[PDB]
Ligand binder design. Structure first.
Ligand SMILES: *[C@@H]1O[C@H](CO)[C@@H](O)[C@H](O)[C@H]1NC(C)=O
Ligand SMILES: *[C@@H]1O[C@H](CO)[C@@H](O)[C@H](O)[C@H]1NC(C)=O
Ligand SMILES: *[C@@H]1O[C@H](CO)[C@@H](O)[C@H](O)[C@H]1NC(C)=O
Ligand SMILES: *[C@@H]1O[C@H](CO)[C@@H](O)[C@H](O)[C@H]1NC(C)=O
Ligand SMILES: *[C@@H]1O[C@H](CO)[C@@H](O)[C@H](O)[C@H]1NC(C)=O
Ligand SMILES: *[C@@H]1O[C@H](CO)[C@@H](O)[C@H](O)[C@H]1NC(C)=O
Ligand SMILES: *[C@@H]1O[C@H](CO)[C@@H](O)[C@H](O)[C@H]1NC(C)=O
Ligand SMILES: *[C@@H]1O[C@H](CO)[C@@H](O)[C@H](O)[C@H]1NC(C)=O
Length: 346
């Protein structure tokens, strides 16, 4: 007595009504308090087909985050195709919160417990809950920040591996720490990553990729070209939009189980030059948004890289190249909603 049906979900959270952070402000009025303790209804001898690439839940989280940003991060100017809108854009407290998406009465959620599950195909080990796990609505490109990790090995997720245009989602099993700071140029910043740990990472990832390719050379290169939001690792820190140059990060070749990288510094750490931008291209809609100059003081963000977004170059020899990607924030949420599927208890 179960199948695949579309329904309108609601969110829950441990948001605090006294906190002036926008994620809390939005949540307390748009979400239900956490259960906060439902239970996993485990199932045996049952197999279902999940498809992280065609899932309503994602579009639903998409609209909410968009709404969340509409109330929270209001641009000074919003230019959309010739027309412009001005409005108050106060500086504010910004720091994402875990968001559990829940199913209404009559419906439930199916959870794949296969720790190797790639996001598509059958799943011989399922379960049941009313709400998903806490998901921080983190908007960023190239690198997935503050997500969950793969409990076992590194998983590679793509709607189609042989179609170089389909986005590759690498789910890391160990997190790489990243620290972006704008020290006391006012719009200048930088992010630090420990090479040795970024090295281990890309080797494991390199191998996991090799297992999906005819032992060709596997090179990593900076994004070919396009908007700054995509050609760079961009994200939001305390309300400020960081655009961090990643050309010293995705720079190395890994063939024959070997690992070789480029762009290091004395302390043995990779540094990324960043700019805090006022003019950005919106991820919510096709339109440009203009914000106020950066606040004062140390603007620093300490995050954990838990996944990558890649893009093979493909082409109609002996060398496959991948470049950082992103842009379509839906991918940022398939990487956390791959475990879930809405079902009708009907
Ligand atoms: C995921 O596993 C399915 C079989 O269950 C397979 O067809 C598909 O190629 C796999 N996807 C990736 C990207 O590993
Ligand atoms: C992390 O995942 C990679 C997948 O390639 C694996 O080689 C490594 O042993 C994993 N570490 C664990 C199991 O903690
Ligand atoms: C994967 O992508 C390739 C290249 O676009 C295409 O020829 C093939 O039909 C796709 N496979 C599936 C399962 O859609
Ligand atoms: C980064 O990776 C290279 C190649 O594996 C390694 O030799 C190097 O020691 C690592 N980082 C540093 C600076 O130790
Ligand atoms: C990143 O920095 C390098 C060296 O300064 C530069 O060549 C490259 O164009 C930068 N990337 C972008 C798109 O800003
Ligand atoms: C890799 O990084 C090095 C060191 O910054 C740089 O000189 C080189 O052009 C980069 N290679 C690319 C862009 O693939
Ligand atoms: C990532 O999570 C940490 C820990 O809560 C937080 O301090 C940091 O601001 C987050 N980074 C981003 C990009 O939101
Ligand atoms: C960041 O990653 C480290 C290392 O795994 C972990 O100890 C810490 O809890 C993480 N912080 C957050 C808030 O994800």
């Amino acid at each position: 007595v179960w199948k695949e049906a579309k329904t309108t979900l609601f969110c829950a959270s441990d948001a605090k009504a006294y906190e002036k952070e926008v994620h809390n402000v939005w949540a307390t009025h748009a979400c239900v308090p956490t259960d906060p303790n439902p239970q996993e209804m485990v199932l045996a001898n049952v197999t279902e087909n999940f498809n992280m690439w065609k899932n309503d839940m994602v579009e639903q989280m998409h609209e909410d985050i968009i709404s969340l940003w509409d109330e929270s991060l209001k641009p000074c100017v919003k230019l959309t195709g010739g027309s412009a809108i001005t409005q108050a854009c106060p500086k504010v407290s910004f720091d994402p919160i875990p968001l559990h998406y829940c199913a209404p009465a009559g419906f439930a959620i199916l959870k794949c417990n296969n720790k190797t599950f790639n996001g598509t195909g059958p799943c011989r080990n399922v379960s049941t809950v009313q709400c998903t796990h806490g998901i921080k609505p983190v908007v960023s490109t190239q690198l997935l920040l503050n997500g969950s990790l793969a409990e076992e090995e590194i998983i590679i997720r793509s709607e189609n591996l042989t179609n170089n245009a389909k986005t590759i989602i690498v789910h890391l099993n160990e997190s790489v720490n990243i620290v972006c700071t704008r020290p006391n140029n006012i719009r200048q910043a930088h992010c630090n990553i420990n090479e040795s740990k970024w090295n281990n990472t890309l080797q494991k990832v390199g191998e996991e990729l090799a297992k999906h390719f005819p032992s060709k050379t596997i090179k990593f290169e900076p994004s070919s070209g396009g908007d700054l939001e995509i050609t760079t690792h961009s994200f939001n820190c305390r309300g400020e939009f960081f655009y961090c140059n990643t050309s010293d990060l995705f720079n190395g070749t890994y063939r024959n189980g070997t690992y070789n990288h480029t762009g290091r510094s004395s302390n043995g750490t990779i540094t990324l030059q960043c700019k805090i931008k006022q003019i950005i291209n919106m991820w919510q809609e096709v339109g440009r948004a203009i914000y106020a100059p950066p606040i004062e003081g140390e603007i620093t963000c300490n995050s954990n890289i838990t996944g990558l977004l890649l893009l093979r170059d493909g082409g109609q020899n002996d060398t496959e190249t991948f470049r950082p990607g992103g842009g379509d924030m839906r991918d940022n949420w398939r990487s956390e909603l791959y475990k879930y599927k809405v079902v009708e208890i009907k």
